[PDB]
Amino acid sequence: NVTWFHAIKRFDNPVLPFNDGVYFASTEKSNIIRGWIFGTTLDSKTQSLLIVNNATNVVIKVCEFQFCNDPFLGVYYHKWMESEFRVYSSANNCTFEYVSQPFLMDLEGKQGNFKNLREFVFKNIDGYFKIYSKHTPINLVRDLPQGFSALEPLVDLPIGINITRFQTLLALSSSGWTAGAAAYYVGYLQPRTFLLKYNENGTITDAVDCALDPLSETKCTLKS
Amino acid sequence: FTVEKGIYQTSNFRVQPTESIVRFPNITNLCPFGEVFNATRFASVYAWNRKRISNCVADYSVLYNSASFSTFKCYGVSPTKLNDLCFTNVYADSFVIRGDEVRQIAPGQTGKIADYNYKLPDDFTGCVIAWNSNNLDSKVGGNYNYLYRLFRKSNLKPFERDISTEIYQAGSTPCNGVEGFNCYFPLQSYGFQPTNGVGYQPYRVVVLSFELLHAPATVCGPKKSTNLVKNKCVNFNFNGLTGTGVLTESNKKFLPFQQFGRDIADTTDAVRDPQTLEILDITPCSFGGVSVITPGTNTSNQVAVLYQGVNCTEVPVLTPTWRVYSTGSNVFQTRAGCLIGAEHVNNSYECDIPIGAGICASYQTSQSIIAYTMSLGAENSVAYSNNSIAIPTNFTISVTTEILPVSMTKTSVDCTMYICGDS
Amino acid sequence: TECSNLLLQYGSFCTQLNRALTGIAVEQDKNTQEVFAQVKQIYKTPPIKDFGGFNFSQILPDPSKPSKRSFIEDLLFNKVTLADAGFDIAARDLICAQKFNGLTVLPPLLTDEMIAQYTSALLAGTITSGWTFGAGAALQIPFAMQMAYRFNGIGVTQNVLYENQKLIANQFNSAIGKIQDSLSSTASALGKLQDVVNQNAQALNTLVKQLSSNFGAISSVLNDILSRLDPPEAEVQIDRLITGRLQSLQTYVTQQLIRAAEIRASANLAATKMSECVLGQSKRV
Amino acid sequence: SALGKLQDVVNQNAQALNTLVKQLSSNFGAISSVLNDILSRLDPPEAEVQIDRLITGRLQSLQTYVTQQLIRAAEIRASANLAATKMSECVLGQSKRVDFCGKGYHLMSFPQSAPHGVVFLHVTYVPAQEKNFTTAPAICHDGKAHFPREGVFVSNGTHWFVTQRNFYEPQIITTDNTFVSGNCDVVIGIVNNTVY
Amino acid sequence: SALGKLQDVVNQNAQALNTLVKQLSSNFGAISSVLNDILSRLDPPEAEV
Numbered sequence A: 001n002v003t004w005f006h007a008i009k010r011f012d013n014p015v016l017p018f019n020d021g022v023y024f025a026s027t028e029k030s031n032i033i034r035g036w037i038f039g040t041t042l043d044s045k046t047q048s049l050l051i052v053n054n055a056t057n058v059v060i061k062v063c064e065f066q067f068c069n070d071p072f073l074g075v076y077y078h079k080w081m082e083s084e085f086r087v088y089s090s091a092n093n094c095t096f097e098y099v100s101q102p103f104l105m106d107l108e109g110k111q112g113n114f115k116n117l118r119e120f121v122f123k124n125i126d127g128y129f130k131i132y133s134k135h136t137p138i139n140l141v142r143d144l145p146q147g148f149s150a151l152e153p154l155v156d157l158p159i160g161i162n163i164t165r166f167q168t169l170l171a172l173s174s175s176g177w178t179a180g181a182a183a184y185y186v187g188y189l190q191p192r193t194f195l196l197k198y199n200e201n202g203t204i205t206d207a208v209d210c211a212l213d214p215l216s217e218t219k220c221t222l223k224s
Numbered sequence B: 001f002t003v004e005k006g007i008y009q010t011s012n013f014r015v016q017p018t019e020s021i022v023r024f025p026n027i028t029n030l031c032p033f034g035e036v037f038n039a040t041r042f043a044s045v046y047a048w049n050r051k052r053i054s055n056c057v058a059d060y061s062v063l064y065n066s067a068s069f070s071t072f073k074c075y076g077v078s079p080t081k082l083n084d085l086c087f088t089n090v091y092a093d094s095f096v097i098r099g100d101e102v103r104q105i106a107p108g109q110t111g112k113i114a115d116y117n118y119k120l121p122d123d124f125t126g127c128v129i130a131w132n133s134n135n136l137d138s139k140v141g142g143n144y145n146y147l148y149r150l151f152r153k154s155n156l157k158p159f160e161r162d163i164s165t166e167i168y169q170a171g172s173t174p175c176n177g178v179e180g181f182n183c184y185f186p187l188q189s190y191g192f193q194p195t196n197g198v199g200y201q202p203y204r205v206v207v208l209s210f211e212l213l214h215a216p217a218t219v220c221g222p223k224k225s226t227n228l229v230k231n232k233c234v235n236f237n238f239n240g241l242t243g244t245g246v247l248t249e250s251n252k253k254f255l256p257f258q259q260f261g262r263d264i265a266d267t268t269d270a271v272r273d274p275q276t277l278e279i280l281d282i283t284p285c286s287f288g289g290v291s292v293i294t295p296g297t298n299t300s301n302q303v304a305v306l307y308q309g310v311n312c313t314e315v316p317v318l319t320p321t322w323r324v325y326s327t328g329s330n331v332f333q334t335r336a337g338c339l340i341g342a343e344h345v346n347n348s349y350e351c352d353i354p355i356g357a358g359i360c361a362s363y364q365t366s367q368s369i370i371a372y373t374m375s376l377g378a379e380n381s382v383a384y385s386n387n388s389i390a391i392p393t394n395f396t397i398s399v400t401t402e403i404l405p406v407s408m409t410k411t412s413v414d415c416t417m418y419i420c421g422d423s
Numbered sequence C: 001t002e003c004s005n006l007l008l009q010y011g012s013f014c015t016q017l018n019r020a021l022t023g024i025a026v027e028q029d030k031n032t033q034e035v036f037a038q039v040k041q042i043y044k045t046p047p048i049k050d051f052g053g054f055n056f057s058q059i060l061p062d063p064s065k066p067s068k069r070s071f072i073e074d075l076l077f078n079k080v081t082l083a084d085a086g087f088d089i090a091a092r093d094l095i096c097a098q099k100f101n102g103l104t105v106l107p108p109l110l111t112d113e114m115i116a117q118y119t120s121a122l123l124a125g126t127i128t129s130g131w132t133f134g135a136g137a138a139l140q141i142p143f144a145m146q147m148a149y150r151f152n153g154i155g156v157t158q159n160v161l162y163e164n165q166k167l168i169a170n171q172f173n174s175a176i177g178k179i180q181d182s183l184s185s186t187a188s189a190l191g192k193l194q195d196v197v198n199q200n201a202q203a204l205n206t207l208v209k210q211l212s213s214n215f216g217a218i219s220s221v222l223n224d225i226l227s228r229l230d231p232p233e234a235e236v237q238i239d240r241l242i243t244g245r246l247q248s249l250q251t252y253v254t255q256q257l258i259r260a261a262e263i264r265a266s267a268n269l270a271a272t273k274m275s276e277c278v279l280g281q282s283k284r285v
Numbered sequence D: 001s002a003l004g005k006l007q008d009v010v011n012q013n014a015q016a017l018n019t020l021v022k023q024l025s026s027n028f029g030a031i032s033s034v035l036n037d038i039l040s041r042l043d044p045p046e047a048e049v050q051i052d053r054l055i056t057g058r059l060q061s062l063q064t065y066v067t068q069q070l071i072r073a074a075e076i077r078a079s080a081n082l083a084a085t086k087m088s089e090c091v092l093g094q095s096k097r098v099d100f101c102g103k104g105y106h107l108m109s110f111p112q113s114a115p116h117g118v119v120f121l122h123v124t125y126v127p128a129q130e131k132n133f134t135t136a137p138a139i140c141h142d143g144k145a146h147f148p149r150e151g152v153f154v155s156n157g158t159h160w161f162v163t164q165r166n167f168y169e170p171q172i173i174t175t176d177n178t179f180v181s182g183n184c185d186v187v188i189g190i191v192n193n194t195v196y
Numbered sequence E: 001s002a003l004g005k006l007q008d009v010v011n012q013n014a015q016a017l018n019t020l021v022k023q024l025s026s027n028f029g030a031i032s033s034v035l036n037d038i039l040s041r042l043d044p045p046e047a048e049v
């Protein structure tokens, strides 16, 4: 069971729990939900993570930063226009800030056959935050597709803080407002044993959830 | 002192490493130990600060050699070994606590300090350093700058920091702000004064909780890395991962953040050199059993040696302690290993001393030990025809003996006597 | 060296373990010798295969192949497949996972070619000499006449064979062909032999995988313990590994001794079948 | 080395006992392998730690010894069962099982007792001096096919006889030596000859 | 006692099984043979020993 959200006035961008990791695959353009928040206060009280993963680079900003009630740019672009500036309320203090290579996701305007399955596994544990990622070129814009593809690790950071909650960051008056056509999933990770098939090349080609059903458990027991 | 004819297994042989190899990332900047140690003021126990240490070279010897520290205890590593050890990340946590509470700092303890403000894990690996700072941070009137959390709803998890000043209420009746019935300010100040007796004096404590050998190491020792040599049985040390084997370039694909590739038995069989981002194959050096082939001693004192499992080119290229047969001139490479001291012949005989893979050794005439392919028997073509029969015209009565074990010695053991002799 | 000196405090446990495994290895060569080396002359069938209509081409050696194995013998050697790695066709080091940790595989005394020769000699002796070569010198007898003796041995008059010799030869030739088809098609025919290979490979893998266990120590890697701890406290961690790894080895050797006993009983039965079913005609039901 | 089988059993048992006794000289991590020395030197609290190490090692030594003895005993039992079967089938009777009571055709066996074992003296019949003969499966006499009642047809080059097929004793081919079955048109290799 | 051979097999297996179960009452040097008692009385650090 993976919840489904509407990335829009109808800001479905709440402070969702980060129970031992989250899965955040999605297909969309402009990256809509570019940034994310991970911490325990998320209102400048503690060094709540402010990771933007914008079109340039994944600017890790784990600062005691302020996130207003609606910390969004409110850019009604292509309806490119801006309404206000609350994406970055204010930096009361900070703890650490890191900037990665100036990459660029495929958020650039392109729908066609949507190759924007930017599958991300955001996991935080043992004073670390991991951003396992994968760019799968899928063909269907509807609900999450069927297939298999392992996510390579992207970022590893010895932060050391304690995190109990998280929140996503949206960059996008109310009369006749066209709701954005963007959505994101929030899966949850729980302790589970998986039988990973490494091909001759060290790429995970298949996996078995050892607790999914009796047949899978039998495969796990036989290690085959 | 006398050995019968046969082949006997003797201490295994092994190729010793030629030389040592050290491969650490090249960094020169020292870690900010002076910042954590000689800081002007230390945070409170409940407000214990955690300063990260990374991307540096730490010379732990200087810290351990200073006598100013009243306590220097390492729980997962020895202080001497730190100088040669390459770590992933280090967390330097500093706080000031009452002297009596130093014991509670150790892992696996309990108490108000261990259950409200600062708790170590059971499996803690690191070093704790402390030293009295009464003269530095004590005043006659009471340096109340240092407080601790005495009241908390629930015990804190290990390495958990609590700063909220919420008024706890043990006896229900939840109040807030001003104190009152059952509700008091959680933080209480220490009476750190120079007149206070030992134990009550303030103590400055710094603890390192570095993680070990699980990820690409970042901080490590002030030991100069040596050159890289491959195709030779050598001792290697990649960021504290010591071992022995023969290096070799590999076609491996490590992900950017990967450094080590382990084996089924949890042994690293492929490494990434920290200085040059290349993957090397790891293989423990060649080994095998050593079998001595001998006829009876009273028949002769000449012997042959089998280095089983290793082809002979290695042997001229150790453990057995007698590298005198290496002169060779009669080294025979069998499918069971190299055989030294035995003359190979094409004549096939009945097997005398089995070597393996159809090879047998015999002592025959001038005298020498020979190695040959065993003969299964005399060739014979039965004169079969469709109208020919052989019929015996005579006979022999043969008497042959067969020996079969039937019983063995009846043995009884008194368990208590054997284990506990009249004790 | 630090671990090795500690291991000396356990006495001669290691010597017992090596001695036990050497007894097993030597016994395997004895098992093969008992079954196959039952003939002291290497009989060879004549160039002219006039055996009264009986086809033995599928069980006689094929000279073309580098190994003088019969057609059916080749099928058998293809059905059975190794599990971990080459035990064999190895032209170099054993090249196995177990090799890394003091585990080695010894080649059998008799090569597959030698065992095939023994089978060829036993087969050539039977079809050219009946059961005489097992009791003494091989006395040739025409195969059809030999089959007449076999029929008498089961209570059927020999005239029955001669008057049905052509039919009987066809049934035998047809029956042999079905064996060839069965082996070529089915896979689980040699389950008994595969089980032995799998059990030994599985036990060996378990022994090697047991080196990844802490057994209560800080780490399962001996070098890591030595690199991090000083001798005094290192011994406590080292001793935990010695106890667990020593227990693991003893468990492996005890199982091998019990498996070896089962294999020896099987080999003794095969040797009795070779003597009583191949070297003679058996009246045991 | 005639009685190597029996000697091996004695040696293995003696070797196992010696290994068991030699294990009492091992520290197993204790300060000393001598239990009295530990007691004389240390007090109960610290002595227990040292004594417990010896108990673990000594107990493990005993278990290893007993397990080996059980496995050896099973091997001896199988040998004893075989010896009992040989006694019944080779000594108390005549065995037609090939090679079960010696090489050759078994005549009789005699038992001899040996230390912790038994020795069987197998008496066998071994044909010695064979001769080539020409042979035929049947004789065609008067349009009838004659087969040997018990024996085989042989020819010395000119004449045909019947002989028992384990010892050359040629005899004239008569109607008592042979039996008739069918005509001469079906048997492959039949040869003309007179049946007296 | 006609079927002693069959009875012995039953007795040996039952006896071995009883010995296995009775072996759960041994301290083996611990404070008690009851696992729950150890957990209820000692903290995880000491309970592990």
Ligand SMILES: *[C@@H]1O[C@H](CO)[C@@H](O[C@@H]2O[C@H](CO)[C@@H](O[C@@H]3O[C@H](CO)[C@@H](O)[C@H](O)[C@@H]3O)[C@H](O)[C@H]2NC(C)=O)[C@H](O)[C@H]1NC(C)=O
Pocket (backbone or CB within 6 Å): A199, A200, A201
């Ligand atoms: C994992 O790695 C192996 C080995 O690198 C990959 O092997 C593939 O083998 C085929 C052989 O036909 C290659 O196709 C060929 O390409 C070569 C080089 O361009 C060309 O000269 C041949 O004529 C043929 O067209 C294929 O390129 C090669 N793949 C790679 C990445 O090298 C294997 O494909 C990889 N994946 C798996 C599941 O094994």
Ligand SMILES: *[C@@H]1O[C@H](CO)[C@@H](O[C@@H]2O[C@H](CO)[C@@H](O[C@@H]3O[C@H](CO)[C@@H](O)[C@H](O)[C@@H]3O)[C@H](O)[C@H]2NC(C)=O)[C@H](O)[C@H]1NC(C)=O
Pocket (backbone or CB within 6 Å): D156, D157, D158, D159
């Ligand atoms: C194959 O066996 C037959 C029978 O044993 C042999 O034919 C026999 O040859 C001998 C001579 O060597 C004959 O003995 C003679 O007896 C007659 C009386 O009948 C006597 O007058 C002669 O002076 C001589 O002593 C024997 O009679 C004869 N039997 C028959 C039926 O012809 C034959 O020699 C053997 N063939 C070969 C190649 O060995």
Ligand SMILES: *[C@@H]1O[C@H](CO)[C@@H](O[C@@H]2O[C@H](CO)[C@@H](O[C@@H]3O[C@H](CO)[C@@H](O)[C@H](O)[C@@H]3O)[C@H](O)[C@H]2NC(C)=O)[C@H](O)[C@H]1NC(C)=O
Pocket (backbone or CB within 6 Å): D140, D184, D185, D190, D191, D192
């Ligand atoms: C055993 O029986 C006889 C013994 O002579 C042989 O088979 C027969 O050989 C004779 C020749 O003497 C043949 O009889 C003849 O037949 C031809 C053709 O019709 C005729 O022209 C002659 O005048 C004479 O009558 C006969 O064909 C031949 N076959 C049979 C079945 O009688 C031979 O020595 C032996 N054959 C066997 C099966 O044992």
Ligand SMILES: *[C@@H]1O[C@H](CO)[C@@H](O[C@@H]2O[C@H](CO)[C@@H](O[C@H]3O[C@H](CO)[C@@H](O)[C@H](O)[C@@H]3O)[C@H](O)[C@H]2NC(C)=O)[C@H](O)[C@H]1NC(C)=O
Pocket (backbone or CB within 6 Å): B393, B394, B395, B396, D128, D129
């Ligand atoms: C069947 O095999 C018998 C051997 O076990 C054999 O008996 C032997 O016959 C020869 C010939 O007489 C005996 O030799 C005596 O005679 C010769 C010639 O004088 C000498 O070389 C001997 O030294 C001795 O003088 C053998 O001694 C004798 N052996 C026995 C145990 O009796 C038979 O001859 C064979 N029978 C046939 C028909 O071939």
Ligand SMILES: *[C@@H]1O[C@H](CO)[C@@H](O[C@@H]2O[C@H](CO)[C@@H](O[C@H]3O[C@H](CO)[C@@H](O)[C@H](O)[C@@H]3O)[C@H](O)[C@H]2NC(C)=O)[C@H](O)[C@H]1NC(C)=O
Pocket (backbone or CB within 6 Å): C055, C056, C057, C058
């Ligand atoms: C005894 O049984 C043998 C197999 O059951 C049989 O061998 C077979 O003989 C036939 C005829 O020579 C071969 O038939 C075809 O094979 C060749 C191969 O190149 C083709 O080119 C021809 O067209 C051909 O007629 C079988 O292939 C052959 N099989 C094998 C494994 O050799 C013998 O013929 C039988 N012996 C007797 C005396 O009957």
Ligand SMILES: *[C@@H]1O[C@H](CO[C@H]2O[C@@H](C)[C@@H](O)[C@@H](O)[C@@H]2O)[C@@H](O[C@@H]2O[C@H](CO)[C@@H](O)[C@H](O)[C@H]2NC(C)=O)[C@H](O)[C@H]1NC(C)=O
Pocket (backbone or CB within 6 Å): B381, B382, B383, B384, B388, B390, D130, D131, D132
């Ligand atoms: C029995 O026969 C074979 C072959 O030769 C004999 O064959 C008979 C059919 C008959 O013609 C007889 O006159 C002839 O002598 C013998 O095997 C032979 O042994 C000799 C020994 O020198 C060799 O020269 C031959 O190569 C060899 N041929 C084969 C196919 O093996 C055999 O010795 C003989 N046996 C007895 C007991 O007489």
Ligand SMILES: *[C@@H]1O[C@H](CO)[C@@H](O[C@@H]2O[C@H](CO)[C@@H](O)[C@H](O)[C@H]2NC(C)=O)[C@H](O)[C@H]1NC(C)=O
Pocket (backbone or CB within 6 Å): B386, B387, C050, D188, D189, D190
């Ligand atoms: C047994 O073998 C012999 C010869 O080895 C066969 O006799 C004949 O031999 C000549 C040789 O040129 C062939 O032309 C004949 O064809 C053979 N006979 C037959 C039927 O083919 C003899 O036939 C064979 N069979 C028997 C029972 O002896």
Ligand SMILES: *[C@@H]1O[C@H](CO)[C@@H](O)[C@H](O)[C@H]1NC(C)=O
Pocket (backbone or CB within 6 Å): B033, B034, B035, B037, B038, B066
């Ligand atoms: C801290 O201070 C003392 C002297 O005040 C000095 O001996 C010590 O080396 C200092 N420690 C560091 C890491 O600088």
Ligand SMILES: *[C@@H]1O[C@H](CO)[C@@H](O)[C@H](O)[C@H]1NC(C)=O
Pocket (backbone or CB within 6 Å): B025, B026, B027, B274, B275, B276
């Ligand atoms: C080690 O030296 C090489 C080049 O001299 C350099 O590329 C590498 O970055 C150095 N190691 C580190 C951790 O910087």
Ligand SMILES: *[C@@H]1O[C@H](CO)[C@@H](O)[C@H](O)[C@H]1NC(C)=O
Pocket (backbone or CB within 6 Å): B298, B299
């Ligand atoms: C071995 O040879 C010596 C001669 O030096 C002899 O005394 C001894 O009896 C022989 N031992 C055996 C078992 O043959």
Ligand SMILES: *[C@@H]1O[C@H](CO)[C@@H](O)[C@H](O)[C@H]1NC(C)=O
Pocket (backbone or CB within 6 Å): B343, B344, B345, B346
């Ligand atoms: C075997 O024969 C060859 C020549 O055929 C000879 O050169 C060789 O030396 C012989 N083998 C040995 C080991 O001497």
Ligand SMILES: *[C@@H]1O[C@H](CO)[C@@H](O)[C@H](O)[C@H]1NC(C)=O
Pocket (backbone or CB within 6 Å): B311, B312, B313, B314, B333, C091, C092
């Ligand atoms: C033995 O190993 C060496 C490499 O050290 C190799 O050159 C040689 O071909 C090998 N010989 C055999 C028979 O495997």
